[PDB]
């Protein structure tokens, strides 16, 4: 009444194919399609650099009178962030504390330095931490003893050295490995996550690492479980030690706790820009050891010490690596167990603000710091997320952040080291529980989730229970395994509609939705929401006829028991107009859209064949209509197209197909 | 001109909305919404056993005068083609052949009784024989000496036994498993498979059985190999051994070999009612020992004996299982082998006619007849294509075949024992490759894949390559595991054209496909053929942006150099109508299709917002038209509505969004 004014003449599919006529634009030399490129253009090296390492051009864009205090303060921020949690890192992996340094040093340098996320953190995960353990302990046990010399129960120090060098020799391997699958650009490859999986995982990790730390907070090492219901088994020897241990290390390590606790609550009381995160561990720590010394705890009531540090030089060096014709199952867990933290960490700092990095040389380059730095003794370095949102909500130009950390890593391992020798294993319990309650708290999500949807929910659930109760490795695969076979599954179940015509209108809409809707008699309408694929063509033809009512199966059964009561693509009706038929129904064609469907296979090309051959044998109609020009060329290119009069009834538009059907029904009444 | 007068005024979506009222439709006793059925008609339990087992009703249904002879002569056939392969299997596996005629017999029995395929032919693959005499291998190796008595190298029969022994435990637990993961009817679920993966499967079969049987062929048993390049070894071995063997039973073998092949040539040269595929093979066999007895060739030349065959009586019985905390490695190898076995088996005797059956509780039959066999001395059984062939051909009306079968099994294995004593083994060698040339033959179809397309071509070599060359269960479940990944990657990458509106029409076809179409200034058309998931966002967007040339971030871009040069949801533009734009474009609109879309993530919707916000912030419209009711309460769901003018900006129709966008522009002009 108003637009949508058309009254256009029949064009199906095939008047408009012989409409227009082809194109070419035929590209030439098929070989060197860019050979002719790569020349020796100075700006051409220059991209190349920028997109390796534009530190050369960050140096203008880089103004001073607010830029140098924000980015100071966050390198002491992170600096602080850092430290208790990298070193936490080393003693989860059961590490000397030297090489938490060294990992806290220089891998973040060569990093950061070669690293295009603009705003982005450095800081190991303890899940690292926690696949050294784990491996270690599945190799390593806990009773090896080879008689050395020590004469004694002294094996703390091979067996240490040890496993140490076998953990500095796999980060290397993993990091050349992630260079070797980084290479081939897979950067625009992996991104087959999603955030119910990596929130699930961070859960179930986050109880992991709670239990394990649990250990290091009560003081008795009673032994250090690995794969199934390990943390399960860790928990039990904790409840059979709950009695008679160090209790009153227990209890101060507890109520300071709750003091910082309490001193949290005070500050998030009231946060502005006065109110800052101070370093209260700090606190802590200083008036801990100076009751200690006050009051003879390590000394008398042996109080536990985390680490220790002379005053003296330690020069690097670069060991060598392990017998991999063994070590190769360990080498390729901890390998994708690698790739998985560095996908995680990119894309946490994916595209959150208008500036775009890359993902290929990211991982090129974390690979190659990992392998560095293993060269020279260290672990697999990370980022993480709270020092990342402090560097980001303060100053982030390029790592002025990662380089004051570094350069307080260099202040406390090369001079101070008396001072920073002894510290209680408590103090980095409570300091990793402050960093992760936040991650905890998720419990408001859950009904979140369930009004969200069942299949999203599922797959947060599962991928948490495969990471927390079941292993680390196997567990991770078989969630990445679901997510991806949840997909396959939604694609198998989708939501039809049987359309019916728009009550005076053109458009076609379900009939059973809103009631006020008609629907044209001697036409059947059928929907799908769904792509086609051969997992996905039977129950397809099934659940159509059951839900259509019509099956031709069953019509011919109907023939069949007609027949019985009076004892080429289309065909004819054998009945002549007696009582026998079921006068149930009349319908004369029948409707089926194509426009949602991606694609088909040769499975759903057979079956639509067989489908639409049979039909048009019962004597009906089959329109199937909704094809422009891409899945016209899929049908075609298939070996099926005989040229029939098939290959001409292609309908480009339901309602044109609706019109024709309805016109040559007309036409037929002579 | 003709038809398609539409002249409707404009309806988005809402105006649709509110034009029609919804409906109820609610279903009470959401628990017992199935408890108020389960009654005791005996219709029900009529029902319930005919899809258990309906012989009660094939019997009228049978008549003689043809019927009978059909299925005799059929019969006759279908056992005279499982004798001769059914004792090549168990020789395969090397299993002494009391079991394969054990197998050959019972467990046909009761599944033929126990199957509803109407026409079904009954016999294993020689997989399965591979399975047992590969798993034997890693286990129980060549060299096995345990001394019993026998003071001499004759321990071939306690480690025969016990070899046996293992595989009807395996047997058995194989149909236990088949069962328990039947009963949860995944008859319904179990359809993950396509045609080129098994075609591969079972060309590398086919491949992998001729290496193996030549080594029978030969009979210098050197070694048999197991896993990785098994085969490849295997042959290594061949090669080392090709010399000063057995070479006059090697030439003897090989001219009846051809000469049986000439006989076939003949028999093709004309086939016809009368031409039928005579049992040849039992001349073969009775010429070939005949000589060897009128000239001394097992007694003086040592020519090879297959089996040994007694007169006497040879009862049943029921053997225990094994230490399954140990041998679990190989149960669930065989468990998921055996099931791979079973549904290919379905899906070759699925829907061919108008009959149907089922899936799950034919699973159930064959599972718990492989158990059943395995307590009375059986391997799992299977059917074949050829023997199938031959019984639809002639006569399947339910088991007549099968039965004869297992008659003129327990026929020979009862009396006959002395003349059906010793075999060579070229015979069976011979029979096997003479029954498997057909599907060897499949170079011709190289070509026609490639033509075909790419992935499929890509899927079907890549299976057979993880087949043949890589092993056996960790090939086969990278195939599957690839066949999933290559659905993704096709939804991964669509085909994407910029539609342009038809000359003097409504439609909207892509612009560079014909080059007889006109497109409407000011405004931008995309279209998508794939849905949405997280795995394909981000991609997604930048090609978007690159094949429309247009992009946000460089608008902005263009934005900051003109601004330089001179030196809430939608927005404006800031230019003041100078020189400093760029007048490239004019487009004022965005339009984006959905019709073909399935569905989207939650990182779909929070990219689509993304996307939207920022474009109405540059200035631009964009219209998102196709959405009828599924997808719009797919986004209605989703926390993003928060009621915006978006809310009602869904167009069901691209056509009715490129009017109503092009009124308000008319309207805009003041």
Known sequence: ?????????????????????????????????????????????????????????????????????????????????????????????????????????????????????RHISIGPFAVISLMIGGVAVRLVPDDIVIPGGVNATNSTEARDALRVKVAMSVTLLTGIIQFCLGVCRFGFVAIYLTEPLVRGFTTAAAVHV??????????????????????????????QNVKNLNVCSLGVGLMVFGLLLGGKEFNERFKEKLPAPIPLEFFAVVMGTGISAGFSLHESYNVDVVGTLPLGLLPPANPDTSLFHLVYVDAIAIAIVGFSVTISMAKTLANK??????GNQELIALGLCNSTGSLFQTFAISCSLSRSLVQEGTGGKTQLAGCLASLMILLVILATGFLFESLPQAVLSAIVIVNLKGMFMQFSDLPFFWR?????????????????????????????????????????????????????????????????????????????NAPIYYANSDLYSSALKRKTGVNPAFILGARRKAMKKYAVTKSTLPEELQRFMPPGDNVHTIILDFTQVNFMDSVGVKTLAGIVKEYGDVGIYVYLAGCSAQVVSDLTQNQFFE????????????????????????????
């Open 353 to 358: 603000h208008g500036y775009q990095v890359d």
């Open 452 to 528: 969200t949807s069942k299949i999203e929910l599922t797959i947060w659930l599962t991928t948490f229970v495969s990471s927390l109760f079941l292993g680390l490795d196997y567990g991770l695969i078989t969630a990445v395994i679901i997510a991806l076979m949840t997909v396959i599954y939604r694609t198998q179940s989708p939501s039809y509609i049987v359309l019916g015509q728009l009550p005076d209108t053109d458009v076609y809409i379900d009939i059973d939705a809103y009631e006020e809707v008609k629907e044209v008699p001697g036409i059947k309408i059928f929907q799908i």
């Open 210 to 239: 709670f239990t394990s730390m649990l250990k290091y907070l009560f003081g008795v090492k009673t032994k250090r479980y690995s794969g199934i219901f390990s943390v399960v088994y860790s928990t039990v020897a904790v409840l």
């Open 1 to 117: 009444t108003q637009r949508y004014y058309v009254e256009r003449p029949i064009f199906s599919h095939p008047v408009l194919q012989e409409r227009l006529h082809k194109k070419d634009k035929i590209s030439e030399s098929i070989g060197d399609k860019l050979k002719q490129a790569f020349t020796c253009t100075p700006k051409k090296i220059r991209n190349i650099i920028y997109m390796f390492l534009p530190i050369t051009k960050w140096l203008p864009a880089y103004r001073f009178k607010e830029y140098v205090l924000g980015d100071i303060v966050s390198g002491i921020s992170t600096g602080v962030l850092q430290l208790p949690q990298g070193l936490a890192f080393a003693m989860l992996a059961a590490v000397p504390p030297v090489f938490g340094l060294y990992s806290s040093f220089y891998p973040v340098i060569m990093y950061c330095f070669f690293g295009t996320s």
């Open 643 to 670: 040229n029939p009069a098939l290959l001409d009834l292609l309908f480009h538009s339901i309602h044109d197909a609706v019109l024709g059907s309805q016109v040559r029904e007309a036409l037929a009444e002579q």
